[PDB]
Amino acid sequence: MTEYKLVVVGAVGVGKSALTIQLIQNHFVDEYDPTIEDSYRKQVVIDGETCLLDILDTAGQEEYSAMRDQYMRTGEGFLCVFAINNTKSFEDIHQYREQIKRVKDSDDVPMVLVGNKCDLAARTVESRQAQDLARSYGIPYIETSAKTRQGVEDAFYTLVREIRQH
Ligand SMILES: Nc1nc2c(ncn2[C@@H]2O[C@H](COP(=O)(O)OP(=O)(O)NP(=O)(O)O)[C@@H](O)[C@H]2O)c(=O)[nH]1
Ligand SMILES: [Ca+2]
Ligand SMILES: [Ca+2]
Numbered sequence: 001m002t003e004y005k006l007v008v009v010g011a012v013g014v015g016k017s018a019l020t021i022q023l024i025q026n027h028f029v030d031e032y033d034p035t036i037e038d039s040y041r042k043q044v045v046i047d048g049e050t051c052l053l054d055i056l057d058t059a060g061q062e063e064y065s066a067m068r069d070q071y072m073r074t075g076e077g078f079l080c081v082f083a084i085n086n087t088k089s090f091e092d093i094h095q096y097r098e099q100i101k102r103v104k105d106s107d108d109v110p111m112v113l114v115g116n117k118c119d120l121a122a123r124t125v126e127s128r129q130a131q132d133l134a135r136s137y138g139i140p141y142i143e144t145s146a147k148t149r150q151g152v153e154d155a156f157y158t159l160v161r162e163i164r165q166h
């Protein structure tokens with residue numbers, strides 16, 4: 001069957017792991033355990049196609065930035081996550097995209113911009129601000145909550161649909 005290699009990137013604490021775990025295991029992780037690098041694999045049906053999602057959950061701790069080149073090499077599409085209550089994480093997106101761009105030597109790498117924690121009211125990144133960033137990259141912007149599940153399937157499935165346009 002078709003395999004899609006997805007990679008989830010973004011700053012510390014934005015909810016990369018909680019998003020992936022909500023998608024794959026259908027529950028919310030409330031606690032914080034920093035990730036080094038974990039892999040998840042699950043068979044799903046997307047738009048009638050039975051396929052395998054292979055998802056790499058990466059570290060947001062800058063201390064592990066040296067690992068980024070390797071995972072940017074293998075991935076077919078990237079979920080670039082920030083949190084809507086974390087302006088610095090939004091500003092950090094470009095460093096993730098710029099490296100993805102250099103490593104892929106491409107300006108059309110499949111990606112989706114994700115604004116996570118949309119269940120929280122302490123918003124400092126307005127939807128339109130993120131829409132503008134995504135537009136400049138030529139990719140969709142989607143808001144999610146790993147806590148409530150809002151947008152979670154949408155974000156990952158949209159990334160699959162982006163890879164399919166490549
Ligand atoms: N309210 C709310 N909290 C969230 C959401 N997503 C993650 N969190 C919380 O934010 C914290 C960090 O989440 P986590 O998924 O570990 O972040 P991460 O981006 O994987 N961190 P790291 O880069 O260190 O691996 C956890 O306490 C988690 O419960 C969300 O959508 N809503
Ligand atoms: Ca829980
Ligand atoms: Ca390279």
Ligand SMILES: [Ca+2]
Pocket residue numbers: 107108109137138139
């Ligand atoms: Ca692009």
Ligand SMILES: [Mg+2]
Pocket residue numbers: 016017018033034035057058059060
């Ligand atoms: Mg994590």
Ligand SMILES: [Mg+2]
Pocket residue numbers: 124
């Ligand atoms: Mg502002």
